[PDB]
């Protein structure tokens, strides 16, 4: 339906991240016009402006967002939530604006066990970096060429959980999954199938 702005534009002007105060502006929102920032302020709180930590059950507000014109930068996630199911229905990240003019998707130092981006089908421009996630799996299975829209888009899956570590806990793609990878263990988490 209607669209909303990103962090630093519109209702989130002069704001650095998505905190427990501006998340209310994402209600009934289907498209983000810019970049959103999920910084460690969102869950450790803010002592200056007295912002309490954003509730992990409140991240389901972003389930209605399926389009991001800018870049998606995540540097903090609740220790309770084991995936990014807040963006479960996110489908496209255009990456017109990029973090440092390079990255359109960044997942840095989270305890999540999976990405859970079941609906993501296109990343138009920008590199994808996923660093410091000790529990993350299903990352090296994803065929990122299917999502990229510009030649030269790179994928940096670095400093993450080992290949055998995920294979030891049976956290791999389902047997029905296509060789292109998956966002989780469930049969619905596949990017394609036959």
């Amino acid at each position, epitope marked *: 339906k209607k669209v909303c702005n990103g962090i630093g534009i519109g209702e989130f002007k002069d704001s650095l991240s998505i905190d427990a105060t501006n998340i209310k502006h994402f209600k009934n929102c289907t498209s983000i016009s810019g970049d959103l920032h999920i910084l460690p302020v969102a869950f450790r709180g803010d002592s200056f402006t007295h912002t309490p930590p954003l509730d992990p059950q409140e991240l389901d507000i972003l389930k209605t967002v399926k389009e991001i014109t800018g870049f998606l930068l995540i540097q903090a996630w609740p220790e309770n939530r084991t995936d990014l199911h807040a963006f479960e229905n996110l489908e496209i990240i255009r990456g017109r604006t990029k973090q440092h003019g390079q990255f359109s998707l960044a997942v840095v130092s989270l305890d999540i066990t999976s990405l859970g981006l079941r609906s993501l089908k296109e990343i138009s421009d920008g590199d994808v970096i996923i660093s410091g996630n000790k529990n993350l799996c299903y990352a090296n299975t994803i065929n990122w060429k299917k999502l990229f829209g510009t030649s030269g888009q790179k994928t940096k899956i*670095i400093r993450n959980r080992g290949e055998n570590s995920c294979k030891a806990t049976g956290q791999v793609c389902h047997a029905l999954c296509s060789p292109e990878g998956c966002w989780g263990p469930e049969p619905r988490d596949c990017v394609s199938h036959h």
Partner: antibody
Amino acid sequence: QVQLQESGPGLVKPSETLSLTCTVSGGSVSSGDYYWTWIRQSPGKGLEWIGHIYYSGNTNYNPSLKSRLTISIDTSKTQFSLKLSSVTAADTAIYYCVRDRVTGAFDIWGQGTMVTVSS
Amino acid sequence: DIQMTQSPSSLSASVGDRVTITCQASQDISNYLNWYQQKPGKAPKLLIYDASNLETGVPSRFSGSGSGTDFTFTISSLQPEDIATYFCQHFDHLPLAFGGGTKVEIKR
């Protein structure tokens, strides 16, 4: 630009705790672009990655030292520290504090401090 | 864990010679590899990042190549100040690890 420097005792008695502090000058430690990392070098072990800490509080430790390892940040004084307990002669090494950019490189190192474990 | 094996362990060459050293990973690590130079009594210095990119400020005679498992570090014209031990380091997945190092000395 940005410089790192180590500080701490050069002699630690066995089974005790090794404590080191890195002071970051010319910049702040509260940036999402860098992993504040500890690295040690010794004969028999070579260059060894000890671990790092992100400004969100998240830490990653080498499983060879995990059980005795603790890395913390003090953004107030722009510092991050290293704590290694139950040390033996196998922990005698040169310890560097390193800026590990998330892009993937140890691009800024400290001069390095010698730590000897001996009674 | 990923094992990084460098070859050779040490070498000596004349000034101006072309020097090539190898880093071999036990697994496919894409281009998640960096090259470091450690001169006597100094901390290691970053020269090559992402296997092939020259760090700003590093002389142009240093270069790196490779992806997957086999990588090569090259000095096009060996100079006397290049006496050092050269390390390769991966950042594919946890934990990070260095190679054993290659000692480079000058023949005069």
